[PDB]
């Protein structure tokens, strides 16, 4: 049992769903403990697909990192063994497919979230927004990457530049989205693509991904560039603007950046 | 001049046709030979675009790599002498444009092969299926790779996941094709393009699409990475599974994959 | 303050509109060069999003490089320094969000210039050219890589091999552009988007700009290849067929091209 | 215990001696996982620095791998789960320094063994070889890429394609080694260093080995590259030289070698 | 003119002599600073080689880097903007030759810092030691880097690993310096040398040390990679050990390092 | 039979004896015509070992490259398809090892060549330099890379920093040497090498020195980072300076360098 999912296998696909709506399924670090301890519990030969799911009628899929767990005080807020960066790097390393399931809207680590899984499937009342310019937060180079694999870079600058909520119809034509579905159809529709996926060869399908897992992340630099790019960050983690933002987000009001 | 495919050349334009309708245009070692020596005699000056097609009126354009020709032995089926790792590089390597002009089912290996050319025009009714994960075959890296330069990570990975074909107007929606034309119009719709592309500046396309293939190449990573993904690779084609994927087929039956 | 370009800032967005219409805002040295300077000017705390256009009822956005200011053959036209290589450099790493506003026709090197912007708001009557093979031109390797982030590679060798022009709506579909709106509307939907853009967090804005731009780059090669590269282009400019090319542009004629 | 090393700690210094002296401490699997288990039951935080050594007096370090346990179907001998690619990953990844202290001659795969470790201290009478090409195997590119840490190009080279022993004094003079001491002196030379490490900081000892490996790694190429590797390592690994190779080792006589 | 620093001009040959004597020539901010700036002064086309020294008679050449400006509470003491890290970039980017002349002993960051000049010549009283273990410091990986290109691996790690002091003689064996002269003798061979190289083509210098510069930096990894090696440095600049290495140091005592 | 050089058959060891003493062995395109053909003629499974040679009794092994073959300016000097880029990659691709056996002074291209081929034997009277800085030539990356795989970073820039020409004694001892004999032993230690190489296992041999080629050049860059070196190299070509060395090599004089 988990205290924040819960996990329906039939025959060879596991569903997990999140259990921590009171929170909107804000990433907080026991929500993602739960979450991965469940999949590695799941990564067995008899399981052979994954989906990832919000409840039944969510408005919110995830409302995205839990802003009370982002570092104020001029620590990097997304290090390596930050739980979004440990989900992200598990679902991507995990051996089998795992596909997300969205109903209700998508928000900043969560759309990280759901860009690192195999495949999504979306309700038509579906939205997503990337959100770090409303906070101030200045996103890892890995997590930058985990968004530049489906839509085009100025698709990736619009969302990230505006933090504007998009469609699921517009989020399907730029390539973020595989199929997007009547609300009634997305478990029935869903449930039918991961029980095909399970009847096909485990192996090949675990060697394929993790194929494609490392040639999406060959794009290599030397020690110099990866440097000058922490230098830069820690400018902005270090800012008045990243206090503001969060400030704001207490405080239920909006940011007044300045450019310092 | 061949046994296996018929030539044409109409000005600058050559019409490459497959002649091995008996096996469904199947990429046997005895027509990948012809295909290649047949693009080689035509690497002259005066020839300027290649059409790769089948014979018009084709259901099947090409049923992909021959199954009786795939290794079952503990070998690699997929090595850099394999036909099909031969012509993809043939074909990325050429210094004219070759256009592939589908009418007809496309299936795996040949799903590769026209994904390697550099446009793809296709009748309305053409479908394309990834199929690796029927028969539990590890698919290599450069082969993926191939895949991996039109479509977003979640298209590809539904495709090879699911091994379900998609339609010439999906496959015109994620940008695996250029043009999808009514089978009546394919081969004029073609020959103008080649044409068109035969009054350009041959040695700037030649140098531009070098360029490219250098580009789409250049995803790099160390040697301890490639030894462990061939370490996989061997662990599937030594696998349980992947003899009872080409069994199946062979017998005409589903297979029972168990995940060793 | 410019002799080429008209500056006009409102609150925290500034629009660079073109003032070169007498030779249809080609790219000339001394319009590049003021350009630069504009945007130099800019780089501003009280600066947060730029805008380039043409000015309103444009039928000509940008008749792409200089034609008088190409080297004739033996030198190579697209070198480091030259004005349309250090403009994309610029706008790539301006710490601002770099908006293409477009209204008339874009050629050659100003559709590359536009594609190193970070997002490309378009009229509906729009057309977009790729033009080397027009003239025998070896486009270079950073120039072909700015142009392969937005659509796919069969897409990218369309446009480039035929150099036809396409239709805002398409480049819309296959990746190229953000928005497609009505010319009477694009003036306001642009500035409504650069408005809200710039209420965000700046230095967000800015390292994660900066980490596309490096991630964009990180396609790596070893020297031989680069070198490889280098001496076919060479083989290019010092081609009969690159000297055909300008002649015949310049003459008014159809080029004749023979691949030496 | 362990049947085949014995393990002395002296403070926070541990020393793995070779108890397989039966056959010459050459690399058999029941060898190598012996000392890889010794060397994980060390990863302790009271233990500091690790030496590796023969026992006083041997004549042979290690006769380098098991003949008798190297595939000579056509299957590879350096596959990435071979003991010997097993041990010098783990000896790199190992979060203390591992010092060989060499007593005695050094063949082949135990060659590539020392080389793999931190610093190598060796007997004036201890001395080198590298024996690939005395059996026709094609040495794996991670092999060789630890072989060229140290000395230069030329000097690996002559190492490589002569086959031929060199001295514990041309092994410091080109760099291999970090030491060279009387036999007598060699036990007591090795500790005091090992000891004198012991008292340094370990986190910033093991980032830096970390830092020094990734470094050593990072020689990226494209899959292409690899493939073709693995292709040509495949025709040796095949040939019939590589048969006659091994069967000329087990039976005594000079190979007759004849290029395929 | 400058506080911490002294010049002399000879001919083309500048002589940046040293003026921190107080410090022992610690890499303090502010003599940083100074000679940082005094090497831009003479970045003019007249200057064709500079040197460095400590002034004639020094016992101490450097004392390495100034641990009163290294920060402790969880900063990274090896940011990208630290002096070390500015100064070592300066150095490798300046178009002229920078002969590192030294008499007495280099500790720590000063032995980076001549390593990354372009050429050593040392009297035969001098020593040289890399201290970060002695420290606790998680040294960066451009830092490590800077020290790879000269001795081979197990010397680097030797030097590192034992904080040891090694002599000229070993220096010049290990292939650290270029030359070991007398102290008497060490201001006229070294002013013979750059004389000699002030005769030579400037242009071709400078374009040749870029090549290197860049060469040697071209060992890349993947945005993971870099990441991981990040989160590693933070565990040990988080550590109670580098705590206790810093005020080990300040009270002149031995530090106790326990392994967290 | 060869204008440009005599080869003799020794067993399996193949000579090739430069004819080219009447301007000093320079590599003039058609020498190194003759060079390229006598290797493609000796790769035949009959020959095992290659050695290069001046005839016994030379002053010069190696003018280097032919002065008056270079361009005046305005050209790269050492572009991919120039006869030392040629030669240097048909060395290092040979599936023979190939000895430099040298006796007499090596020049410029000629030092290049030597160290790009296998292993370097040289008489106790032999000398090399490095010479591009006498005549200001932007040496190019992959010609630099060549130089870099022996002697440490240090060492390579004075070589070429001063042009001053070394001994065969240092030449040994900074690791550029394999063997330094007298030369009168000089033609038999070498054969006894070439010999006893030409008993190994030639396919190990061969795929070995390619995955030495492959490691060696496995040093990646962005495409940005090698048009920038491309721009400087370019810059001095086309300088006053390059046109002064050129003009002084032909005048017989001194050149005056001014770094423009
Ligand atoms: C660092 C990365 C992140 O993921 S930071 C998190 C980004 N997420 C967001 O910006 C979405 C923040 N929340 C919202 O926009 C709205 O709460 C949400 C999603 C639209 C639904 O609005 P609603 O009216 O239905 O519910 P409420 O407005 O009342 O919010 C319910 C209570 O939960 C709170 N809440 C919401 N999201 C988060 C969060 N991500 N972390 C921590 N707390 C959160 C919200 O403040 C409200 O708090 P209380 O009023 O105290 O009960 S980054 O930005 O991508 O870089
Ligand atoms: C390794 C990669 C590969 O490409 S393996 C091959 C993947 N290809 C496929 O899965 C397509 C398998 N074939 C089919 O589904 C059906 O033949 C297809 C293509 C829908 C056509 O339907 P159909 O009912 O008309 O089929 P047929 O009557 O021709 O069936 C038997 C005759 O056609 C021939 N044929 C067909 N496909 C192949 C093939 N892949 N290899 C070798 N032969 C093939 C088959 O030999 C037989 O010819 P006959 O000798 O006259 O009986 S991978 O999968 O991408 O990893
Ligand atoms: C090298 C890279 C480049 O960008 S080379 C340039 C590529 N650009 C093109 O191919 C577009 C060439 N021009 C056109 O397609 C048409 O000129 C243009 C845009 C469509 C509209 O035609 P139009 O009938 O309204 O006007 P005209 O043709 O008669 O010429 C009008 C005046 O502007 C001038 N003009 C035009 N194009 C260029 C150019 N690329 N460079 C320099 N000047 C140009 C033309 O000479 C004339 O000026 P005046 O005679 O002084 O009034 S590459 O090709 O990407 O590699
Ligand atoms: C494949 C990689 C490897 O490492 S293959 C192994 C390379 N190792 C060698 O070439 C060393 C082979 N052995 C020798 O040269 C001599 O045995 C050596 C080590 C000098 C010891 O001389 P010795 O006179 O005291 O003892 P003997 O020669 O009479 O042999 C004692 C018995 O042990 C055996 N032996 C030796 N080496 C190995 C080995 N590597 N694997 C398996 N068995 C080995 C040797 O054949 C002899 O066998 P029997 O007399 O039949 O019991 S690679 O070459 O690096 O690629
Ligand atoms: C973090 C990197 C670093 O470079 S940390 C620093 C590594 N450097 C060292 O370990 C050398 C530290 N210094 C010494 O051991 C001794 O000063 C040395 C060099 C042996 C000479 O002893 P001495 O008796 O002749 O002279 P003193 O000790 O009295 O010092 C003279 C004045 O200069 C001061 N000084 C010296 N070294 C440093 C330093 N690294 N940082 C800051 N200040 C330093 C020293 O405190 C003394 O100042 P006063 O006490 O005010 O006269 S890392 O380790 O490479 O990672
Ligand atoms: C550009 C790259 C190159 O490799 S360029 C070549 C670099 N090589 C050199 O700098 C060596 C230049 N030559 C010399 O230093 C001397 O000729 C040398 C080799 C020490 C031999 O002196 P010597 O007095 O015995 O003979 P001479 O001076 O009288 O010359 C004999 C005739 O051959 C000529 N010669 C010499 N070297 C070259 C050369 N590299 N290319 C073309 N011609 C050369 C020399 O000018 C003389 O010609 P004549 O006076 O016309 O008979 S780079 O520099 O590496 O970047
Ligand atoms: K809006
Ligand atoms: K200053
Ligand atoms: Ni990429
Ligand atoms: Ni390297």
Same mark, same amino acid.
């Given at each position: 049992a988990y205290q924040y999912v819960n996990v329906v296998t039939i025959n060879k696909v596991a569903v997990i769903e999140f259990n921590y709506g009171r929170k909107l399924n804000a990433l907080?670090? &026991?929500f993602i403990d739960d979450l991965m301890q469940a999949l590695s519990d799941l990564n067995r030969p008899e399981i052979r697909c994954i989906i990832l799911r919000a409840p039944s009628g969510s408005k919110v899929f995830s409302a995205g990192h839990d802003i009370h767990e982002l570092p104020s005080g001029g620590r990097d807020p997304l290090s390596y063994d930050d739980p979004?960066?440990?989900?992200?790097? !598990?679902?991507?390393?995990? *051996?089998?497919?795992?596909?997300? =399931? +969205?109903?209700?809207?998508?928000?900043?680590?969560?759309?990280?979230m759901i860009m690192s899984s195999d495949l999504i499937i979306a309700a038509?009342?579906?939205?997503?927004? !990337?959100? *770090?310019? @409303?906070?101030? &937060?200045?996103? @890892?180079? &890995?997590?930058?990457? @985990?968004?530049?694999?489906?839509?085009?870079?100025? #698709?990736?600058?619009?969302? #990230?530049?505006?933090?504007? *909520?998009?469609?699921?119809?517009?989020?399907?034509?730029?390539?973020?989205? @595989?199929?997007?579905?009547? &609300?009634?159809?997305?478990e029935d529709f869903t449930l039918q693509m991961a029980h095909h996926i399970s009847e096909k060869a485990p192996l090949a399908i675990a060697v #394929?991904? %993790?194929?494609?897992?490392?040639?999406?992340?060959?794009?290599? =630099?030397?020690?110099? %560039?990866?440097?000058?790019?922490?230098? !830069?960050?820690?400018? +902005?983690? $270090?800012?008045? $603007?990243?206090?503001?933002g969060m400030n704001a987000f207490l405080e239920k009001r909006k940011p007044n950046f300045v450019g310092h």
């Open positions: 907080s670090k &026991v979004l960066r440990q989900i992200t790097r !598990m679902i991507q390393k995990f *051996p089998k497919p795992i596909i997300s =399931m +969205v109903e209700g809207s998508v928000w900043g680590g969560a759309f990280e038509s009342t579906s939205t997503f927004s !990337m959100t *770090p310019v @409303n906070l101030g &937060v200045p996103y @890892n180079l &890995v997590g930058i990457h @985990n968004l530049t694999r489906d839509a085009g870079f100025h #698709i990736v600058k619009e969302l #990230i530049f505006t933090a504007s *909520p998009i469609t699921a119809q517009r989020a399907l034509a730029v390539g973020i989205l @595989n199929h997007v579905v009547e &609300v009634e159809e997305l #394929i991904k %993790e194929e494609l897992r490392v040639l999406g992340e060959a794009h290599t =630099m030397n020690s110099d %560039e990866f440097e000058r790019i922490q230098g !830069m960050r820690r400018a +902005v983690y $270090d800012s008045e $603007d990243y206090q503001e």
